[PDB]
Amino acid sequence: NSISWEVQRFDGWYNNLMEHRWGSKGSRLQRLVPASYADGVYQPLKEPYLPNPRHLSNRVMRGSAGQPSLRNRTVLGVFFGYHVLSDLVSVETPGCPAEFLNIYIPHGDPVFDPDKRGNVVLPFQRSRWDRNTGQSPSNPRDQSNQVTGWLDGSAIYGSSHSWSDTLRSFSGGQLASGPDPAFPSDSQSSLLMWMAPDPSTGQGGPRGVYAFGAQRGNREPFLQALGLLWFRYHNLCARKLAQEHPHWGDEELFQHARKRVIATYQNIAMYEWLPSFLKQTPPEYPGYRPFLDPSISPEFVVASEQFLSTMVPSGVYMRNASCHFQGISGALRVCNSYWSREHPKLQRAEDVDALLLGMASQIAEREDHVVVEDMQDFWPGPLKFSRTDYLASCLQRGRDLGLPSYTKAREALGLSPISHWQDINPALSRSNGTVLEATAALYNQDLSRLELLPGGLLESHGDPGPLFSTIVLDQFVRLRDGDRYWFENTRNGLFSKEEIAEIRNTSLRDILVAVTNVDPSALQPNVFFWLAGDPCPQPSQLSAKGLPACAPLFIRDYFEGSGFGFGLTIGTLCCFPLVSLLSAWIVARLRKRTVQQFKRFIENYRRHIGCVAVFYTITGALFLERAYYYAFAAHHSGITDTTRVGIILSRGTAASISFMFSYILLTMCRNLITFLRETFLNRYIPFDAAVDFHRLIASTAIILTVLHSAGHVVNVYLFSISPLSVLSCLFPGLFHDDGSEFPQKYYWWFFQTVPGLTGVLLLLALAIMYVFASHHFRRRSFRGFWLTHHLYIFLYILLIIHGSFALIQMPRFHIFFLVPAIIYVGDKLVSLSR
């Protein structure tokens, strides 16, 4: 047809001829310095050795918000950088088994511990890692990247083909839209986007959560504006091709517009944003290097993404097309806008245009150690709190990733050594000098322990600084030269020589004018800076004065209103015998209207003792095997971190009663018993006592099902107060970890699961079958006993259904049940002809 090139894959595979897995999604992060863990493998450095994160965030990274930038960078550049980094790296998804590296709030923190108590732990969960790297010291743990490491527009289209399919309309070569053709469609709501709740109101529905290529693209309205820009631009390119080539299909239009959009994105992200972030122009394209390794390093996550927080402001303006600022004060508070669902100011298309223009004409914050409170106090918390500390959780993520120190990273990259604390930043030491002293006091004057993030911020004066600039520039050069599909690589057949020039002469103002139909004289040529002549100046530098206050903190309680119903359910399950006893009572009422003696006993019942001993040792062996496996040999699946005593007590008795209930029919195989009664086996096994053995196996297998049911009553309680990110690791295919952390209620485990619902019926069947088959009622009414005792058919049916739907392990009851059932039914058929 018209596709005369090799279309680029969505997941990044087969981009390199030799290393197929480079850049693919789910691939390792390849580090620059060997991992610095506590034991050499997978164990982070901690608070006795390194200072407290929340206590470090208060001494260095704290101050006012009216600090203008040195280079007059604009907010549009900051959030365009956030968008680019969402394209490149994503390491914020918690991994299995659930591991926690918590943040202990010091006593008296005026934010997270106002009413002064002792233990105000903020949860924090370690991220996903590669399953071939966590065991031995010459191969420490390596985390995995959730997106494609190439700069291939994996934030507009998705990191897989099945993801991109849910974004297209398959008509006109366009991405799917909603009621308004200027916004995406929020229809898919189950496994696409991140459904985190709004911290300021608690709303958590999928209504208003647009569908982008990045799973967390709705984090802020200001990061949403860039996604809307790149959505509208695709729908604009694929609509001009359909005007020039009216005979093209839908796949041709999509694959021709996607190519142009990716190339324009690469041009901007490399030759217009990078020269502004670093103030260094990258070297010109030498050609495709098939041997350069383009992998993302964990230090790049800190040098680029965690550094941008020093520039985020407290409020964001909105602007007319002709220098009018009162929302097309009228600024948006950043703390009150996290995971916003349907903002009453950003519902039309002109409103998003106004947001982009206001961001374009607003100068960002100064590049230094200070960070505004909308991030270090009111960041949306992922567990139990709804607010957290972004800096304290960035320090805890550096420790989780095993990142090097500051002086150790500054050495592997070939930078000059540093001896004193007053050498990290001589200008900062001359002006303030009270921040370096506080950092020294926190580290006990051990400069070789200062970690990567606090060091790179103290080193930054107006730009990222010597250490961060090096990492960022090297990473981007390796991403450009190592990618086969870079729009300048003339040997991939994407673009001709003239199209490459037409792309290399495109900017972000050209895109803001194409999407937002405004005159090009309403913006400045370089929208990443605002200089002394550009149009529509600020009203004033936007500090945190006049803006509305941030919404306060509230703690989420999962087991909030489940106290009364849980007690009723447990009491009802415990009152099953007391209703069958009443039914049997009224049924009967209506049916009426020295040592020598010891050794003598031993020598009498030698055979009975032997048989009972063998039976109970087999049941004990089964219990001990399961208890061993769950106590000493199952750590790779963190189930004993949630329930330890419960799961052992409930999975041992399971394997023992699977045997007691299966082999209880060999005591009622009457014809087989009467045939073996006269055999050499009679010297060993007393077949006269075959019913007394029935009542022994039966009355000792209910004392174990009570322990089973109680163990699972304890488990179901601990499963209904644990977060969703833990249950997603325990029971895959039954739970999926999206943003909204809330487990299923208790009654979902009891009445809406296969095991939980068959278990209650099993308890009822046993409560009837045991009370009616009692010596007090069997002696008074044989018909009632005989009718109720036929519940064993229903019992074995329920026992075969119960073990299915493999939740903890694959079923085993049918293995226990095959042989005795066959012997029993054969003996039953034999006793039918006679």
Binding site: E6, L191, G249, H736, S804, M810
Partner: protein, 273 residues
């Protein structure tokens, strides 16, 4: 033999024409039929037809219950499209893509319209299983390392765990319980043949009804998936792929209704005369 060249046996190594676990069943039941045909002339002339039908239908039902379980033609789809073929090549091929969704996996077939197009032989038939003892994700990762053609991997990842279209859990559970019902129906067929040999008319006629009801229950379990793969797009270039009910579905329906009819006829004929 004769060794005068290298290698000694210079010839193309063959491939088995059809599925193996189906040829085994066909050969087993043909062998049993041949054995009973050999024994047939040793029975009285009157009851020859009464034995022939009673053994042929019993064997046919027992074979269908077992072949439908391991079959992969419950829901099937097919389309002819032009797609890409491999990496590092801008060339497109004209193929016949197909889907075959069974109870414990899916078979994907890519076959060129001419089998020889790019100096290659495009006759693939790939299987990805989601049974309780298997892992779909590891099989897909292994089929991605070894580089299969592009459309095979597309259709293979549509069914992968944690995809925007949630087919994995639904198809896995439905296939699991349909397979369980089919095994129970096979057990009931065995017991029906046993309790029919020795003279028990009521119990045989009542086990045939169970043999039918469990097949219909398997149909009910598997039919809870058609409402899920309908909205998810299976576009392959300029062609869409629609799946409908395959032959195994209607075969199970037919034999289930047959067993139910036989059970009812036996019960009625046992009551009145």
């Amino acid at each position: 033999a004769l060794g005068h060249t290298l290698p000694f046996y210079t010839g193309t190594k063959p491939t088995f024409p059809m599925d193996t676990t189906l040829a085994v069943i066909i050969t087993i039941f043909l062998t049993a039929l041949v054995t009973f045909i050999i024994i047939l002339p040793g029975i009285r002339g009157k009851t020859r037809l009464f034995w022939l039908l009673r053994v042929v239908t019993s064997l046919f039902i027992g074979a269908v219950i077992l072949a439908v379980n391991f079959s992969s033609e419950w829901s099937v789809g097919h389309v002819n499209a032009n797609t890409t073929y491999k990496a590092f090549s801008p060339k497109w091929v004209s193929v016949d893509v197909g889907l075959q969704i069974g109870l414990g996996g899916v078979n994907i077939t890519l076959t060129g319209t001419p089998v020889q197009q790019l100096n290659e032989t495009i006759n693939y038939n790939e299987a990805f299983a989601w049974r309780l003892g298997r892992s779909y994700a590891e099989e897909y990762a292994k089929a991605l390392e070894k580089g299969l053609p592009d459309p095979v991997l597309y259709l293979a990842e549509k069914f992968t765990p944690r995809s925007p279209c949630g087919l994995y859990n639904q198809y896995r559970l439905a296939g699991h319980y349909a397979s369980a019902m089919l095994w129970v129906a096979f057990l009931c067929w065995l017991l029906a043949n046993v309790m029919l040999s020795m003279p028990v008319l009521v119990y045989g006629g009542h086990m045939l009804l169970a043999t039918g009801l469990f097949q219909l229950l398997a149909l009910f379990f598997f039919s809870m998936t058609t409402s899920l793969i309908s909205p998810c797009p299976l576009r392959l270039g300029t062609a869409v792929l629609h799946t409908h009910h395959g032959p195994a579905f209607w075969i199970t329906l037919a034999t289930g209704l047959l067993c139910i009819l036989l059970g009812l006829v036996m019960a009625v004929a046992h009551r009145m005369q």
